[PDB]
Amino acid sequence: GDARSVRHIAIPAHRGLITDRNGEPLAVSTPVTTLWANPKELMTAKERWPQLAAALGQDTKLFADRIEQNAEREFIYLVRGLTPEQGEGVIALKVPGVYSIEEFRRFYPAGEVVAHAVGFTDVDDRGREGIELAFDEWLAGVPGKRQVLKDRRGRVIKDVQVTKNAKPGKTLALSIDLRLQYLAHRELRNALLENGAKAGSLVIMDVKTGEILAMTNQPTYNPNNRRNLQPAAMRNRAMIDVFEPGSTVKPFSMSAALASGRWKPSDIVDVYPGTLQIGRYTIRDVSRNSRQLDLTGILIKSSNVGISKIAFDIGAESIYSVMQQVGLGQDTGLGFPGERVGNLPNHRKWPKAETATLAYGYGLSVTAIQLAHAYAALANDGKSVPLSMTRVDRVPDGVQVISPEVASTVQGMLQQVVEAQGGVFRAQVPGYHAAGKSGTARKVSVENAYRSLFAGFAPATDPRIAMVVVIDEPSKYFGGLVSAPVFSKVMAGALRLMNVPPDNLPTAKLVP
Ligand SMILES: *C(=O)[C@@H](NC(=O)/C(=N\O[C@@H](COc1ccc(C(=N)N[C@@H]2CCCNC2)cc1)C(=O)O)c1csc(N)n1)C(C)(C)NOS(=O)(=O)O
Ligand SMILES: [Cl-]
Ligand SMILES: [Cl-]
Numbered sequence: 001g002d003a004r005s006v007r008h009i010a011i012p013a014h015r016g017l018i019t020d021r022n023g024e025p026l027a028v029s030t031p032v033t034t035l036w037a038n039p040k041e042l043m044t045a046k047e048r049w050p051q052l053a054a055a056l057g058q059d060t061k062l063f064a065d066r067i068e069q070n071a072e073r074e075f076i077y078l079v080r081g082l083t084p085e086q087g088e089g090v091i092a093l094k095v096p097g098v099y100s101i102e103e104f105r106r107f108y109p110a111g112e113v114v115a116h117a118v119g120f121t122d123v124d125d126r127g128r129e130g131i132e133l134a135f136d137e138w139l140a141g142v143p144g145k146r147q148v149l150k151d152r153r154g155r156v157i158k159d160v161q162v163t164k165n166a167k168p169g170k171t172l173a174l175s176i177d178l179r180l181q182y183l184a185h186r187e188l189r190n191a192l193l194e195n196g197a198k199a200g201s202l203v204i205m206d207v208k209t210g211e212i213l214a215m216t217n218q219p220t221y222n223p224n225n226r227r228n229l230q231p232a233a234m235r236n237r238a239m240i241d242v243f244e245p246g247s248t249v250k251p252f253s254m255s256a257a258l259a260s261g262r263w264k265p266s267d268i269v270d271v272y273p274g275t276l277q278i279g280r281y282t283i284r285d286v287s288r289n290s291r292q293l294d295l296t297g298i299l300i301k302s303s304n305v306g307i308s309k310i311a312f313d314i315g316a317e318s319i320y321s322v323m324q325q326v327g328l329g330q331d332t333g334l335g336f337p338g339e340r341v342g343n344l345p346n347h348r349k350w351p352k353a354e355t356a357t358l359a360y361g362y363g364l365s366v367t368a369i370q371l372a373h374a375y376a377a378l379a380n381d382g383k384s385v386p387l388s389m390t391r392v393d394r395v396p397d398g399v400q401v402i403s404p405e406v407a408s409t410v411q412g413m414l415q416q417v418v419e420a421q422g423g424v425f426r427a428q429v430p431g432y433h434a435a436g437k438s439g440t441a442r443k444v445s446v447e448n449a450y451r452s453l454f455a456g457f458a459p460a461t462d463p464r465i466a467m468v469v470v471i472d473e474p475s476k477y478f479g480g481l482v483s484a485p486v487f488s489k490v491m492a493g494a495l496r497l498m499n500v501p502p503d504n505l506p507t508a509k510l511v512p
Contacts, residue, residue, distance in 0.1 A: 004149055011144025012103045015125055016169030018118060020178040021391045026118050029104040033087025035078040038154045039071050041097025048095045055090045074154025081105050110178060112220040113185045116236035117176060120223040133337045141169035173391040175211035180204055183493045184214040191486045192218045196475035201238040203372040203468045204494060207457060209392045210385035240338040242365040246439035247302045248455045249361040251378060251410050252326060254295060256318040257310045258406045265409060268292045271305040278353045283308050296413045300423045304360045311359035316350035319359055325401040326374035328366050332387050342366045372468040375455045379463035382407030411435055415460045427484040429491045431502035433460035436487065438479030449473050452482035458491050461503040467491055
């Protein structure tokens with residue numbers, strides 16, 4: 001039939017390393033040794049089989065069955081992906097017909113801690129989820145090709161000849177700081193356990209560079225062992241899940257009020273009796289023991305009524321404009337697999353009820369990433385630096401989306417939300433002035449179910465990082481009792497890790 005045969009073999013390309021921003025390995029192509037066999041040669045050395053089988057960790061008779069059943073094939077795999085050292089002891093047995101191929105297997109040194117961001121490759125070493133998928137072309141490289149001239153009995157007579165070399169993939173350095181990532185991962189997980197919550201997300205970003213410094217979710221999974229992996233655990237919820245932001249968008253409503261020319265911080269709004277009726281609907285505050293609140297007090301008490309009255313006065317168009325311009329419900333440009341854009345509703349003419357509900361964050365849907373980016377722009381004196389999941393060496397120009405004077409005023413109000421009497425004191429960061437806003441969003445007709453939110457930034461004197469904590473369905477639940485302490489603990493550790501000077505460790509009690 002055939003005197004010879006020409007078999008073609010690909011030379012595997014070394015897949016690009018993924019590191020965090022400091023060069024810590026997050027995805028590594030590690031060398032592995034695959035053993036294959038020519039059964040026609042192996043069948044001439046049967047008395048070596050029990051020793052070979054032992055070296056492979058395989059049952060003597062099952063190994064023998066496998067060879068005998070494939071006795072005519074010129075090629076079977078004995079085992080793929082042993083360690084180089086395990087392969088080295090088998091090669092030393094010098095069994096006829098047993099040969100080795102070096103290939104690579106992806107290893108994820110941080111495991112579940114950064115699994116949602118990094119993703120993973122399939123058995124064919126192709127990116128399937130996360131960054132591995134999004135940057136697959138960058139990471140993959142260009143494999144080579146060999147030619148093997150084989151026998152009529154499958155024995156490779158002519159030594160392989162290399163057609164094309166293997167071109168390695170490119171290194172990729174993420175924006176993530178693995179130190180902050182571990183801190184965020186451990187504090188979110190502990191908070192979930194303490195609160196009996198179903199899921200959660202935590203985003204940390206650099207307000208000055210747009211970099212995503214940490215992005216963790218629960219549940220998570222071990223990418224190095226995906227046996228019994230369930231779909232819910234795979235979700236990078238910070239990017240691919242949407243939620244109503246509720247009270248956490250009130251600083252943007254307040255930004256529109258101050259940009260309107262119609263409102264100044266010392267203005268007061270009468271929110272008594274803690275409710276406001278619009279047709280058949282009643283807007284309700286949680287704490288309903290207030291009458292006059294100034295604009296800062298409306299944020300401290302989180303008065304839906306107060307922000308609603310302001311929204312009626314200034315018009316929803318101005319609030320829509322700020323929310324759109326800080327990115328809520330807008331494409332982020334990151335291109336993360338499955339990333340959601342959410343929804344910021346718009347109208348030619350805004351009905352009165354929807355003007356109020358926009359202003360306190362009902363009925364729009366955002367991602368944790370978007371909410372964090374919005375807070376980063378506010379923290380950065382109103383200038384939005386573009387998002388990045390990769391290390392930023394040369395920072396692109398930002399876009400001024402809130403005037404610096406309005407941004408600075410709203411920043412001070414959010415510092416009061418954390419530090420003033422009656423505010424979110426469990427969000428305070430010891431040694432630092434922190435600023436932010438809690439939220440609690442009921443999942444309407446979705447039976448005693450809520451999300452607890454906190455969004456903020458620090459240090460208030462020169463903001464460095466913005467943070468969003470989302471805790472999904474705690475079993476207690478308020479934003480200020482559930483997500484606020486997580487913000488405090490993670491913000492304190494992250495500021496320390498970044499060597500940020502404390503701006504609230506005075507040694508003297510000053511007066512005023
Ligand atoms: C802002 O986010 C805003 N939230 C809402 O109006 C929305 N839902 O509100 C839910 C009620 O939320 C709370 C109730 C009670 C408390 C609280 N501190 N008191 C106790 C805590 C322990 C349990 N017993 C009560 C805190 C929050 C609701 O209506 O069920 C909302 C907006 S969009 C959407 N889908 N839902 C409020 C709650 C006014 N401010 O939020 S904040 O986090 O408290 O600052
Ligand atoms: Cl609190
Ligand atoms: Cl509601």
